[PDB]
Design a protein around this ligand. Structure first.
Ligand SMILES: O=C(NCc1ccc(-c2nc3ccccc3c(=O)[nH]2)cc1)OCc1ccccc1
Ligand SMILES: [Zn+2]
Lengths: 162, 47
């Protein structure tokens, strides 16, 4: 049921998402080991994900959560990086997309830093890198990330030591 | 997949040491996220 619609680099919607990617790059404590050494991305394509059934599943849960939180969904736009990006756009998120050993428990993780999500694109800790060169810092191979609509509702605030 | 903390729908993981590091978020239901945009990119080598 999923179709992908390309956005034009001349479209404001494209420029906004690119701006969100580029401005949320930061330095990482690992000096680039997991995600590579870069300050900016070369954006190759941005696509809208349209899927009626996945959308309705999302908005139905949003409504429950919103009502449980006194008419406040607490909805955000956040990055997600994963080796399973292709399965996610066709099937949606589920428990096999969870990070079992994550610091805040076993759930689906999302980031405000685009470069945080970039660290997971080839796997935990960047796996073994791009499939072709086995290079976590590959400047050649194409990477993919999602920018996702996320309902937080009543979010439990946990400070980390990072 | 764990349940979210009692009375809560998600976790906000907020770095307390790196002041330049932004938040991370966890949900425990797949139906609480929709993958709106697919971004295809390369990282760029610094000059
Ligand atoms: O099991 C995984 N990945 C599950 C997973 C997916 C996304 C994330 C993820 N974690 C984050 C943590 C903090 C902030 C952001 C993120 C994020 O965007 N994604 C974590 C784990 O990788 C192993 C692997 C490696 C190579 C091939 C197949 C599988
Ligand atoms: Zn490569």
């Amino acid at each position: 049921g999923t179709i992908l619609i390309d956005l034009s680099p001349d479209d404001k919607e494209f420029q906004s998402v690119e701006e969100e990617m580029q401005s949320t790059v930061r330095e990482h404590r690992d000096g680039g080991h997991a995600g590579g050494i870069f300050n900016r991305y070369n954006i190759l394509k941005i696509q809208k994900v349209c899927n009626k059934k996945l959308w309705e599943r999302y908005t139905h849960r949003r409504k429950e959560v919103s009502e449980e939180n006194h008419n406040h969904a607490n909805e955000r736009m956040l990055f997600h990086g994963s080796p399973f990006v292709n399965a996610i756009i066709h099937k949606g998120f589920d428990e096999r997309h969870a990070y079992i050993g994550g610091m805040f428990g076993a759930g689906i993780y999302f980031a405000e830093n685009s470069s945080k999500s970039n660290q997971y694109v080839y796997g935990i800790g960047g796996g073994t890198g791009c499939p072709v060169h086995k290079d976590r810092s590959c400047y050649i191979c194409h990477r993919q990330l999602l920018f996702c609509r996320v309902t937080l509702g009543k979010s439990f605030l946990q400070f980390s030591a990072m | 997949m764990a349940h979210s903390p009692p009375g809560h729908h998600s976790v906000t993981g907020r770095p307390s040491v790196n002041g330049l590091a932004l938040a991370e978020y966890v949900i425990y239901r797949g139906e609480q996220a929709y993958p709106e945009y697919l971004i295809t990119y390369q990282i760029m080598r610094p000059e």
